[PDB]
Design a protein around this ligand. Structure first.
Ligand SMILES: [Cl-]
Ligand SMILES: [Cl-]
Lengths: 8, 90, 8, 90
């Protein structure tokens, strides 16, 4: 429940 | 040791990169400190603009995203027409 | 702005 | 081809794993289809319970998380006292 990778 | 400036025009919707790291994700075993580019899309704006996988994001439009949390970095990248990134390539 | 990895 | 059942006691807070994939993340270039375990913590409940990095999550408490979206999978894992996962290790 923690973003470890974010694509943009 | 290298440091480059990336000029990504904003308001272009999909950017074409992915980030990892943060000043809070340095606990759960990235092993180095900082935010990092993990993927650059082939046709991505970030790829063609020079951004490479492995580049640490030091600054975003003057901010010192260095030693910042992961979500702090996401917010710093999403909020800013002209995206000025200072990144490291060491 | 899309979770590509979630730790739990 | 292997298929294993993992019994993770729930209500234990931190689980000790990380997931990737989804039926919507199969577009932006994981190249195989499905959700996958990408990290198992050394002292993690998932690591000791048998879950390995690379395991595709086929089911969660009976649900067919297979061919599900990334957030669908996160929700399927967070909502359920006894976490019954069916995973593949091919
Ligand atoms: Cl991407
Ligand atoms: Cl982890």
């Amino acid at each position: 429940q923690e973003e470890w990778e974010t694509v943009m | 040791g290298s440091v480059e400036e990336i000029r990504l025009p904003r308001a272009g919707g999909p950017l074409g990169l992915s980030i990892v790291g943060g000043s809070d994700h340095s606990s759960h075993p990235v092993q180095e400190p900082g935010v990092f580019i993990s993927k650059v899309l082939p046709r991505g704006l970030a790829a063609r603009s020079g951004l490479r996988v492995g580049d640490r994001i030091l600054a975003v439009n003057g901010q010192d995203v260095r030693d910042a949390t992961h979500q702090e970095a996401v917010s710093a990248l999403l909020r800013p027409l002209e995206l000025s990134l200072l990144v490291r390539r060491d």
